């Protein structure tokens, strides 16, 4: 697994056509946007709610989105 | 520390006074440092029987088994130098 640092790369990754799945996890302090690509599982630790919403709109509707919470699926 | 048995006190009391005497002279000269013929430093120590290495100088020298230069091996170098000079001159 790899970790992306700032906001610019994740959108470029999201807009890239190499995506396969997206899973969003909400923790007691932050929100993680794990993007499942072909090779790696990129993740992004987000602590700003407004910036998280911007990310959620950036997700193409065709891809499958999994929401994870205190109870695992 | 010791009256007269300096380096051969590690042999204790079990090899004969005469044999411990002979081995003392050889072991002292085998473990001492010698003047290095290329850098004039007391920095040559034996690595194996016949191989001597200059520590702070980076050279390997072939020598005697326990001493850097043997008496027989020193006169020979003198002899060859005289022979070479005579041959080169007429």
């Amino acid at each position: 697994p790899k970790q992306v640092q700032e906001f610019k790369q994740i959108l470029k990754l999201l807009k890239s056509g190499s995506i396969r799945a997206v899973r969003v996890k909400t923790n007691g302090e932050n929100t993680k946007f794990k993007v499942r690509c072909a090779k790696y599982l990129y993740t992004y630790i987000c602590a700003d709610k407004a910036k998280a919403e911007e990310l959620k709109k950036a997700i193409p509707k065709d891809i499958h989105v999994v929401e994870i919470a205190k109870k695992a699926p | 520390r010791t009256k007269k048995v300096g380096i051969v006190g590690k042999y204790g009391t079990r090899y004969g006074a005469s044999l411990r005497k002979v081995i003392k002279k050889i072991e002292i000269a085998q473990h001492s440092k010698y003047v290095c013929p290329f850098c004039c430093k007391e920095a040559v120590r034996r690595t194996a029987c016949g191989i001597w290495e200059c520590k702070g100088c980076g050279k390997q020298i072939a020598g005697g088994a326990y001493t850097l230069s043997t008496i027989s091996g020193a006169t020979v170098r003198s002899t060859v130098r005289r022979l070479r000079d005579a041959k080169n001159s007429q």
């Binding site: - | 016949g50 191989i51 390997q60 020298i61 072939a62 020598g63 043997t70 091996g73 170098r77 002899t79």
Partner: protein, 246 residues
């Protein structure tokens, strides 16, 4: 009777040489035109310890007088050689320690080592630690020179036999007294199986000709003819003399 220990030595089963960590064959390089009529220069890359022998070995590196590459040789160190030294092999080589010259060019009285008994056979005589041979005289009529072997014997060789000027390194090795049985055990690490030697008188009559009776003794003279068969040739052989020398 049985077959004695000297008979079992000639089959070479456990008496084979323990030569696994040895460096290799130590000898001059093969003779060629450039050694017959010129000089080839070698570089003493390093001096190494060859197991089983008391003299150090030099890893000389000549270049390639006829092709491209390196000719990694393996000489026997002469006393005084050092790493990074240049040595010249050939008929025109200067009379310096470590140089290889035909035995005819050496002035009478020169001390050489690693001499070839026959031209081009890459070294026979004067190869142990501290040993050397002296040139006695030349004979230009039949191209022969006389040398004095380390045993004292005089030998006549061809004047073009090669030899290395100097003294084999590591002299004075045997003057240090072994003190312990264990130390002698380690001496034959890279040699044959010979060390713990049981006296013939301590054996039984089947084992050895000396294997005695109610008192440990030989019984018959220990000086024997050279023609004795293997099996009874035990002791002094063709002894011209006995007893302490005066």
């Amino acid at each position: 009777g049985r077959r004695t220990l000297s008979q079992r030595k000639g089959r070479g089963s456990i008496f084979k040489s323990r030569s696994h960590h040895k460096l290799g064959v130590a000898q001059h390089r093969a003779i060629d035109f450039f050694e017959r009529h010129s000089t080839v220069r070698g570089l003493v890359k390093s001096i190494e310890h060859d197991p089983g022998r008391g003299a150090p070995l030099a890893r000389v590196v000549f270049r390639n007088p006829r092709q491209y590459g390196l000719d990694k040789e393996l000489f026997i160190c002469a006393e005084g050689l050092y790493s990074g030294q240049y040595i010249y092999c050939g008929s025109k080589a200067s009379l310096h320690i470590g140089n290889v010259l035909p035995i005819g060019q050496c002035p009478e009285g020169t001390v050489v080592c690693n001499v070839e008994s026959k031209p081009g056979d890459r070294g026979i005589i004067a190869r142990a630690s501290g040993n050397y041979a002296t040139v006695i005289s030349h004979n230009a009529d039949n191209e022969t020179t006389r040398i004095r072997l380390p045993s004292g014997a005089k030998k006549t060789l061809k004047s073009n036999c090669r030899a290395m000027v100097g003294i084999i390194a590591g002299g004075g090795r045997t003057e240090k007294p072994i003190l312990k049985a264990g130390v002698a055990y380690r001496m034959y690490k890279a040699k044959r199986t010979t060390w713990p030697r049981v006296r013939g008188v301590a054996m039984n009559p089947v084992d050895h000709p000396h294997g005695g009776g109610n008192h440990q003794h030989v019984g018959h003279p220990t000086t024997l003819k050279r023609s004795s068969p293997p099996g009874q040739k035990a002791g002094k052989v063709a002894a011209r003399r006995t007893g302490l020398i005066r």
